[PDB]
DNA sequence: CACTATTTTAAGAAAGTGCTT
DNA sequence: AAGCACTTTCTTAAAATAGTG
């Protein structure tokens, strides 16, 4: 199942500020969006892969 | 929403090539069966590798092609783009 | 479409001709899109049931057919039976 | 030969795999 | 642990088109 428009909005907003998150950034973002730390880690990896054209 | 321009990333180009090559062969198969026609499809990719489909014996279609003398519908990329633009 | 159709010969001549004209253009449009998106040279040869010829080629038909006839390496080759087998394997 | 309700296609999203850093 | 470089499995917007006026 896909993330809410609100979750993807916040992930994209953070991504344009920092392409890589530390563990504390990732775990706190996961807590605010109500996703697992894994889901944020993998969203960041997939987003970086997609930005390479 | 898809602009028809070269996919410049090789990895994305190859994923689209594989999906759309099968999609095109599937539509050729459907047209050949629905409308009782003979179709040959030759594809050379950017490395000049050959992929082919034919609804029937390829050599019989190509022989009929080479012996055909009458004027007939003949489309290319240039005139397909012009047709699509005229649907403004 | 307004209804799903089975892929079987259309027995009504008028419906067969209307479908042929619409789908032939749709097929040539998809060949054009593949050619441009993925930098491919393509030839498409169609004989209808009366043996009339309709063709598409990306840039030049004779160049693609010459490259075809000179190609000596083994290469992917598909028939109606292989397309059907692929579609079945997608349950 | 134009329209549009409906089906079909293919691009894109989250997760899977199996390496390397 | 997490990155990386694909790959798989889907979802769903976008495109095609079957029946229709």
UniProtKB/Swiss-Prot annotation, chain A:
Residues 1-53 bind DNA. Changing residue 52 to R: In ASD7; somatic mutation. Transcription factor required for the development of the heart and the spleen. During heart development, acts as a transcriptional activator of NPPA/ANF in cooperation with GATA4. May cooperate with TBX2 to negatively modulate expression of NPPA/ANF in the atrioventricular canal. Binds to the core DNA motif of NPPA promoter. Together with PBX1, required for spleen development through a mechanism that involves CDKN2B repression. Positively regulates transcription of genes such as COL3A1 and MMP2, resulting in increased pulmonary endothelial fibrosis in response to hypoxia. It comes from Homo sapiens. The homeobox domain binds to double-stranded DNA. Homodimer (via the homeobox); binds DNA as homodimer. Interacts (via the homeobox) with TBX5 (via the T-box); this complex binds DNA. Interacts with HIPK1 and HIPK2, but not HIPK3. Interacts with the C-terminal zinc finger of GATA4 through its homeobox domain. Also interacts with JARID2 which represses its ability to activate transcription of ANF. Interacts with FBLIM1. Interacts with TBX18. Interacts with histone methyltransferase NSD2 (via HMG box). Interacts with NEDD9. Interacts with TBX1. It is found in: Nucleus. The chain holds residues 143 to 195 of 324 of the full protein. Belongs to the NK-2 homeobox family. Expressed only in the heart. This is Homeobox protein Nkx-2.5.
UniProtKB/Swiss-Prot annotation, chain B:
It comes from the Eukaryota. Phosphorylated on these sites by MAPK14/p38alpha and MAPK11/p38beta, but not by MAPK13/p38delta nor by MAPK12/p38gamma. Has no effect on nuclear location nor on DNA binding. Sumoylated with SUMO1 and, to a lesser extent with SUMO2 and SUMO3. PIASx facilitates sumoylation in postsynaptic dendrites in the cerebellar cortex and promotes their morphogenesis. Isoform MEF2 and isoform MEFA are expressed only in skeletal and cardiac muscle and in the brain. Isoform RSRFC4 and isoform RSRFC9 are expressed in all tissues examined. The modification Phosphoserine is found at residue 55. It is found in: Nucleus. Disulfide bonds: none annotated. Residues 1-53 form the MADS-box domain. Belongs to the MEF2 family. It is linked to Coronary artery disease, autosomal dominant, 1: A common heart disease characterized by reduced or absent blood flow in one or more of the arteries that encircle and supply the heart. Its most important complication is acute myocardial infarction. Binds DNA as a homo- or heterodimer. Dimerizes with MEF2D. Interacts with HDAC7. Interacts with PIAS1; the interaction enhances sumoylation. Interacts with HDAC4, HDAC9 and SLC2A4RG. Interacts (via the N-terminal) with MAPK7; the interaction results in the phosphorylation and transcriptional activity of MEF2A. Transcriptional activator which binds specifically to the MEF2 element, 5'-YTA[AT](4)TAR-3', found in numerous muscle-specific genes. Also involved in the activation of numerous growth factor- and stress-induced genes. Mediates cellular functions not only in skeletal and cardiac muscle development, but also in neuronal differentiation and survival. Plays diverse roles in the control of cell growth, survival and apoptosis via p38 MAPK signaling in muscle-specific and/or growth factor-related transcription. The gene is MEF2A.
From Swiss-Prot, chain C:
Signal peptide: none annotated. It comes from the Eukaryota. Phosphorylated on these sites by MAPK14/p38alpha and MAPK11/p38beta, but not by MAPK13/p38delta nor by MAPK12/p38gamma. Isoform MEF2 and isoform MEFA are expressed only in skeletal and cardiac muscle and in the brain. Isoform RSRFC4 and isoform RSRFC9 are expressed in all tissues examined. Residues 2-56 form the MADS-box domain. Disulfide bonds: none annotated. It is linked to Coronary artery disease, autosomal dominant, 1: A common heart disease characterized by reduced or absent blood flow in one or more of the arteries that encircle and supply the heart. Its most important complication is acute myocardial infarction. Transcriptional activator which binds specifically to the MEF2 element, 5'-YTA[AT](4)TAR-3', found in numerous muscle-specific genes. Also involved in the activation of numerous growth factor- and stress-induced genes. Mediates cellular functions not only in skeletal and cardiac muscle development, but also in neuronal differentiation and survival. Plays diverse roles in the control of cell growth, survival and apoptosis via p38 MAPK signaling in muscle-specific and/or growth factor-related transcription. Binds DNA as a homo- or heterodimer. Dimerizes with MEF2D. Interacts with HDAC7. Interacts with PIAS1; the interaction enhances sumoylation. Interacts with HDAC4, HDAC9 and SLC2A4RG. Interacts (via the N-terminal) with MAPK7; the interaction results in the phosphorylation and transcriptional activity of MEF2A. This is Myocyte-specific enhancer factor 2A. The chain holds residues 2 to 92 of 507 of the full protein.
């Amino acid at each position: 199942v896909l993330f809410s428009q609100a979750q993807v909005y916040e992930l994209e907003r953070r991504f344009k500020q920092q392409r890589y998150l530390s563990a504390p950034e990732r775990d706190q973002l996961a807590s605010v969006l109500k996703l697992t730390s894994t889901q944020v880690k993998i969203w960041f990896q997939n987003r970086r892969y997609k930005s390479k054209r | 929403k898809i602009q028809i321009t070269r996919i410049m990333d090789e990895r994305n180009r190859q994923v689209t090539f594989t999906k759309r090559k099968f999609g095109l062969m599937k539509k050729a198969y459907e047209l050949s069966v629905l409308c009782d026609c003979e179709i040959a499809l030759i594809i050379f990719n950017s490395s000049n590798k050959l992929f082919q489909y034919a609804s029937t014996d390829m050599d019989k279609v190509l022989l009929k092609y080479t012996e055909y003398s009458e004027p007939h519908e003949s489309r290319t990329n240039t005139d397909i783009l012009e047709t699509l633009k005229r649907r403004e």
